[PDB]
C-alpha cells in the first residue's frame with residue numbers, strides 16, 4: 001500500500017537487500033537512451049559558470065560511487081540526490097534545450113522505477 005511505502009521511504013533504514021534494489025534502479029537509468037547528459041559530471045568547459053550557478057551538482061557516476069560506498073541510510077536521501085540531477089538540469093538550461101528534455105524523460109522513468117522499488121520493498 002501507499003501508506004506502507006511512504007512510511008518505509010522516510011523511516012526504514014536501507015538494508016543490503018535494499019541496496020541490490022538501488023543498484024538495479026541506478027543501472028536501469030544508466031542504460032536509458034535519454035541518460036546521455038547525466039552519466040558523468042557536467043563539463044565546466046561546455047557549460048559557462050555551471051559550478052557558480054548550480055550549488056549542489058550531481059550525476060549518475062557520483063550516485064554510483066555513493067551506492068557502492070553505502071552512503072545512503074534512508075531512501076529519501078537517495079531520491080533527494082537523484083532529484084538534484086533533474087532539478088539542476090532544468091534550472092541551468094532553457095525549457096527548449098535537449099538537456100532539459102532528457103531531464104523530463106529520465107525523471108519520469110526514475111519515478112516509475114522508484115515506485116516499483118518501493119512496492120518490492122513493502123511486500
Ligand SMILES: Cc1c(Nc2ccc(S(=O)(=O)N3CCN(C)CC3)cc2F)nc2ccc(-c3cnn(C4CC4)c3)cn2c1=O
Pocket residue numbers: 036037038039040041042043046047048089092093094099
Ligand atoms: C547536464 C548537462 C550536460 N551534461 C553532459 C555531461 C557529459 C557529456 S559528454 O558527452 O560526456 N561530453 C560532451 C563534450 N564535452 C567536451 C565533454 C563531455 C554531455 C553532457 F551533455 N552538459 C551540458 C553542456 C552544456 C550546457 C550548456 C551550455 N550553455 N548552456 C546554456 C544555459 C546557458 C547550457 C549544459 N549541459 C548540461 O546541463
